[PDB]
Design an enzyme around this catalytic site. Structure first.
Site, PDB file in Angstrom:
ATOM      1  N   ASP B  91      49.893  36.665  22.058  1.00 49.73           N
ATOM      2  CA  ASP B  91      50.049  38.109  22.103  1.00 49.73           C
ATOM      3  C   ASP B  91      48.895  38.779  21.350  1.00 49.73           C
ATOM      4  OD1 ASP B  91      51.032  40.637  22.376  1.00 49.73           O
ATOM      5  OD2 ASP B  91      53.043  40.167  21.586  1.00 49.73           O
ATOM      6  N   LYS B  93      46.872  41.130  22.676  1.00 47.95           N
ATOM      7  CA  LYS B  93      46.714  42.512  23.109  1.00 47.95           C
ATOM      8  C   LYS B  93      45.258  42.969  23.037  1.00 47.95           C
ATOM      9  CE  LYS B  93      51.334  43.852  21.591  1.00 47.95           C
ATOM     10  NZ  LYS B  93      51.392  44.171  22.950  1.00 47.95           N
ATOM     11  N   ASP B  96      39.621  46.381  24.067  1.00 50.38           N
ATOM     12  CA  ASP B  96      38.285  46.897  23.768  1.00 50.38           C
ATOM     13  C   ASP B  96      37.442  46.772  25.042  1.00 50.38           C
ATOM     14  OD1 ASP B  96      36.046  47.754  22.202  1.00 50.38           O
ATOM     15  OD2 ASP B  96      36.644  46.469  20.530  1.00 50.38           O
TER      16      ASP B  96
HETATM   17  O1  LIG Z   1      55.872  46.381  23.990  1.00 48.49           O
HETATM   18  C1  LIG Z   1      55.818  45.298  23.302  1.00 48.49           C
HETATM   19  N1  LIG Z   1      56.877  45.125  22.424  1.00 48.49           N
HETATM   20  C2  LIG Z   1      56.977  44.019  21.597  1.00 48.49           C
HETATM   21  O2  LIG Z   1      57.993  43.925  20.809  1.00 48.49           O
HETATM   22  N2  LIG Z   1      55.951  43.036  21.662  1.00 48.49           N
HETATM   23  C3  LIG Z   1      56.008  41.824  20.817  1.00 48.49           C
HETATM   24  O3  LIG Z   1      57.257  41.169  21.146  1.00 48.49           O
HETATM   25  C4  LIG Z   1      57.788  40.622  19.956  1.00 48.49           C
HETATM   26  C5  LIG Z   1      59.232  41.161  19.839  1.00 48.49           C
HETATM   27  O4  LIG Z   1      59.807  40.695  18.617  1.00 48.49           O
HETATM   28  P1  LIG Z   1      61.314  41.144  18.203  1.00 48.49           P
HETATM   29  O5  LIG Z   1      61.494  40.479  16.855  1.00 48.49           O
HETATM   30  O6  LIG Z   1      62.224  40.621  19.255  1.00 48.49           O
HETATM   31  O7  LIG Z   1      61.352  42.676  18.068  1.00 48.49           O
HETATM   32  C6  LIG Z   1      56.878  40.946  18.780  1.00 48.49           C
HETATM   33  O8  LIG Z   1      56.016  39.839  18.423  1.00 48.49           O
HETATM   34  C7  LIG Z   1      56.040  42.051  19.301  1.00 48.49           C
HETATM   35  O9  LIG Z   1      54.769  42.094  18.682  1.00 48.49           O
HETATM   36  C8  LIG Z   1      54.866  43.177  22.523  1.00 48.49           C
HETATM   37  C9  LIG Z   1      54.761  44.309  23.358  1.00 48.49           C
HETATM   38 BR1  LIG Z   1      53.155  44.398  24.527  1.00 48.49          BR
HETATM   39  O1  LIG Z   2      35.886  53.043  22.810  1.00 44.71           O
HETATM   40  C1  LIG Z   2      35.299  52.138  22.081  1.00 44.71           C
HETATM   41  N1  LIG Z   2      34.010  51.854  22.441  1.00 44.71           N
HETATM   42  C2  LIG Z   2      33.270  50.904  21.748  1.00 44.71           C
HETATM   43  O2  LIG Z   2      32.044  50.645  22.118  1.00 44.71           O
HETATM   44  N2  LIG Z   2      33.869  50.268  20.640  1.00 44.71           N
HETATM   45  C3  LIG Z   2      33.176  49.300  19.808  1.00 44.71           C
HETATM   46  O3  LIG Z   2      31.902  49.910  19.386  1.00 44.71           O
HETATM   47  C4  LIG Z   2      30.902  48.907  19.441  1.00 44.71           C
HETATM   48  C5  LIG Z   2      29.757  49.472  20.377  1.00 44.71           C
HETATM   49  O4  LIG Z   2      28.715  48.466  20.540  1.00 44.71           O
HETATM   50  P1  LIG Z   2      27.393  48.685  21.479  1.00 44.71           P
HETATM   51  O5  LIG Z   2      26.680  47.339  21.396  1.00 44.71           O
HETATM   52  O6  LIG Z   2      26.625  49.794  20.884  1.00 44.71           O
HETATM   53  O7  LIG Z   2      27.846  48.977  22.920  1.00 44.71           O
HETATM   54  C6  LIG Z   2      31.561  47.594  19.921  1.00 44.71           C
HETATM   55  O8  LIG Z   2      31.842  46.677  18.833  1.00 44.71           O
HETATM   56  C7  LIG Z   2      32.855  48.043  20.523  1.00 44.71           C
HETATM   57  O9  LIG Z   2      33.906  47.079  20.469  1.00 44.71           O
HETATM   58  C8  LIG Z   2      35.138  50.515  20.287  1.00 44.71           C
HETATM   59  C9  LIG Z   2      35.883  51.427  20.969  1.00 44.71           C
HETATM   60 BR1  LIG Z   2      37.704  51.610  20.280  1.00 44.71          BR
END
Ligand SMILES: O=c1[nH]c(=O)n([C@@H]2O[C@H](COP(=O)(O)O)[C@@H](O)[C@H]2O)cc1Br
Ligand SMILES: O=c1[nH]c(=O)n([C@@H]2O[C@H](COP(=O)(O)O)[C@@H](O)[C@H]2O)cc1Br
Lengths: 258, 258
Positions: B91, B93, B96
């Site tokens: 997980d 997520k 970027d």
């Molecule tokens: O919308 C979401 N809801 C969530 O709860 N999760 C993950 O699912 C897991 C739910 O854990 P819980 O203890 O049953 O609440 C937890 O690790 C969250 O980070 C991930 C998403 Br994407």
């Molecule tokens: O909307 C966004 N745009 C981005 O470019 N970034 C970060 O900013 C940094 C831009 O790097 P660049 O090499 O100048 O393209 C990079 O580490 C991205 O993960 C983060 C976000 Br949140």
């Protein structure tokens, strides 16, 4: 109402400690440039922070891309931040339910909150994401940035999404010190605006990144700080690239100030 | 869309290798339960994976919350996943720009791509987030789940946002195998639906989480797999708890199957 300098905003009654510390060094060093150190080796991260430290107001990290990360590396990095005077911004992107993010923020191998002055988070999960981080950030005197807009093609951080971010940041000002956006999104001077996707020339990469210049971002769009990675890192002369972006972003700031 | 069993969908057309493997073991072991192993110790993570392996079709991890993470731990977790027959879902997520997520997916200390069967991603950055991950995951036969909806109060993953999540998955079906949603968002049977925010109750936590029952999510809402964390983890006897959630979600499934 009227555009206030970085130094004056640093003293605003509702200013957050972290944001004040930043604004003060920005004006002192005449830099509103945030270097995006996206490297795979610590020694590389440390080498760049030292060499470009005098030219920046902040260093953004992606600690999870470092093959040899250790907490001793972060200790060294902080020494450079204190020496050169710039903040550390871990671009971690918290984007989960509050109960999970406080754990990802404080614990694990990275223990981000133990060395990151700033961290950012996506608002998509609802305010619970800010309230969860807060529990960890406030005790540690940290600050948080909410991603209101994104630079990538196809971004969904628009319209109502962007407005939701603003309302969320203004309702948690004790912890949220600003935004990651493409332009000014809040009319409250206590909030900082950091803009990624910046380069002198027009263009982008083949994985969704889009670029705008410092004058456009800072001057025409009203943002405060420019975040630059490849624009500086892939250049043959990195210190000269840093200065060019620094002077670019600073002069745009000054012009808009009057 | 008439209602087909897991064993049938696993033999479907455009079915991705991983999705196919997963659906086959679900049918074999009679389980559409995904364990959210949110613990901070590698020892506890492995012990839960061993004891609950036979009861689950998938094990969801948050490696950045493991205080003692090493690749040897993942090595052993993989041995367990192969033994008891369950997929490993990190997980992470990803949310970027593509050039960044591909590095966070491939390298760093976690080297997620090397041991994770599945990973998820927020769609807010645009399709570019899927493209960068794809470059790393396609050759390894990995899969990606797009976060179409979220379980927390105030979630912005709704209306057009959710619609955009579905369009993206359908546009990258070569790597995107399903969604993280509160209910069925796609009618294409090759797409999996995993739902977090589940407990036999219907309640929540102090940080935004909201709960619904297996019967509600699987049976009424048409989801495929329940992601359960605290509803099992907090129990004295986690195995008995896992078995309880397993029968609940399987029977909810058998009901709509007709
Ligand atoms: O919308 C979401 N809801 C969530 O709860 N999760 C993950 O699912 C897991 C739910 O854990 P819980 O203890 O049953 O609440 C937890 O690790 C969250 O980070 C991930 C998403 Br994407
Ligand atoms: O909307 C966004 N745009 C981005 O470019 N970034 C970060 O900013 C940094 C831009 O790097 P660049 O090499 O100048 O393209 C990079 O580490 C991205 O993960 C983060 C976000 Br949140």
């Amino acid at each position: 109402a009227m555009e206030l300098s970085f130094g004056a905003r640093a003293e605003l009654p509702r200013i957050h400690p972290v944001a004040s510390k930043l604004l003060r060094l920005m004006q002192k060093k005449e830099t509103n440039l945030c270097l995006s150190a996206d490297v795979s080796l610590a020694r590389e991260l440390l080498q760049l922070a030292d060499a470009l430290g005098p030219s920046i107001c902040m260093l953004k990290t992606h600690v999870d891309i470092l093959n040899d990360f250790t907490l001793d590396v972060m200790k060294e990095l902080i020494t450079l931040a204190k020496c050169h005077e710039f903040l550390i911004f871990e671009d971690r992107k918290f984007a989960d339910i509050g109960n999970t993010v406080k754990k990802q923020y404080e614990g694990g191998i990275f223990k981000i909150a133990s060395w990151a002055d700033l961290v950012n988070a996506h608002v998509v999960p609802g305010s619970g994401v800010v309230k969860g981080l807060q529990e960890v950030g406030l005790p540690l005197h940290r600050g948080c940035l909410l991603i209101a807009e994104m630079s990538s093609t196809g971004s969904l951080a628009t319209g109502d999404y962007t407005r939701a971010a603003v309302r969320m940041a203004e309702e948690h000002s004790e912890f949220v010190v600003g935004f990651i956006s493409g332009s000014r999104v809040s009319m409250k001077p206590e909030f900082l605006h950091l803009t990624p996707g910046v380069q002198l020339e027009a263009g982008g990469d083949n994985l969704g990144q889009q670029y705008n210049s410092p004058q456009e971002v800072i001057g025409k769009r009203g943002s405060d700080i420019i975040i630059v990675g490849r624009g500086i890192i892939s250049a043959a002369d990195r210190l000269e690239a840093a200065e060019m972006y620094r002077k670019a972003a600073w002069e745009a700031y000054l012009s808009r100030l009057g």
